[PDB]
Design a protein around this ligand. Structure first.
Ligand SMILES: [Cl-]
Ligand SMILES: [Cl-]
Ligand SMILES: [Cl-]
Ligand SMILES: [Zn+2]
Ligand SMILES: [Zn+2]
Lengths: 146, 144
């Protein structure tokens, strides 16, 4: 419901950016749709578990890997980010991705893990971090002093 | 054993929830999920402090309290006073932002100031509850 809406939002984003990832960009339409749905479902679950589990994502950036660069934000008149110093940009554990790899191989049975790592997993990670970034923006808006 | 401790802390959070405006009126299902988050994160904060050298006061081991000897004798029950070494702080306070973010997934309109005034005091009470349980277990274990 609320979960399915968020998953659908994430699936639509996955389609928008899919052309950047060589392992999904040229799949047949029906397979591409199934793959992107798997990636969005696993990525959203990975995000949700990491936010609710103590220690499962970085406690300074809350998963985004990024922090505000105060001086550059002032200079440029827009939010400029830098790497999160605490997690040096990792944001969230990468171990849950193995489950997504297994689910994708059921749809792409010749996809090896190193080919996944280079050509598909970057989209999975783009989706996980997209969720942490959405949460950070929602928090910034909710708590603005203006 | 961890889940038992958290579930115990969760039940205590329910008992005292009425005293904290940010949880005392949540609807049954949401209230349970929020209190489970609070207990889970509070227990993790406690465990980190207990395991990290220097993260707790070496006299009170996190409770912020000491036994008032003269009042305990007068009243025939343990009566506490502020721990002198730490002036009642008990443990180094770490930011509770991760817990706040986990709660806001369940209560999307909860601002950080409202959290700080009306929910975070319960969170802090749950953390100290854990140090107090440890202290009682130690007292009982070492009573002659
Ligand atoms: Cl992987
Ligand atoms: Cl007392
Ligand atoms: Cl009392
Ligand atoms: Zn970080
Ligand atoms: Zn002390």
């Amino acid at each position: 419901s609320d979960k399915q809406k968020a998953i659908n939002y994430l699936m639509q984003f996955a389609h928008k950016v899919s052309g950047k990832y060589r392992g999904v960009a040229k799949l047949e339409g029906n397979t591409k749709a199934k793959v992107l749905q798997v990636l969005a479902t696993f990525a959203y679950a990975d995000y949700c578990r990491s936010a609710a589990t103590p220690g499962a994502r970085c406690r300074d950036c809350h998963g985004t890997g990024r922090a505000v660069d105060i001086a550059k934000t002032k200079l440029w008149g827009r939010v400029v980010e830098k790497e999160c110093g605490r997690c040096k940009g990792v944001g969230y554990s990468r171990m849950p991705a193995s489950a997504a790899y297994r689910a994708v191989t059921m749809l792409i049975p010749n996809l090896t893990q190193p080919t996944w790592s280079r050509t598909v997993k970057p989209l999975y990670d783009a989706l996980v971090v997209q969720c942490h970034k959405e949460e950070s923006i929602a928090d910034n808006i909710l708590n603005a002093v203006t």
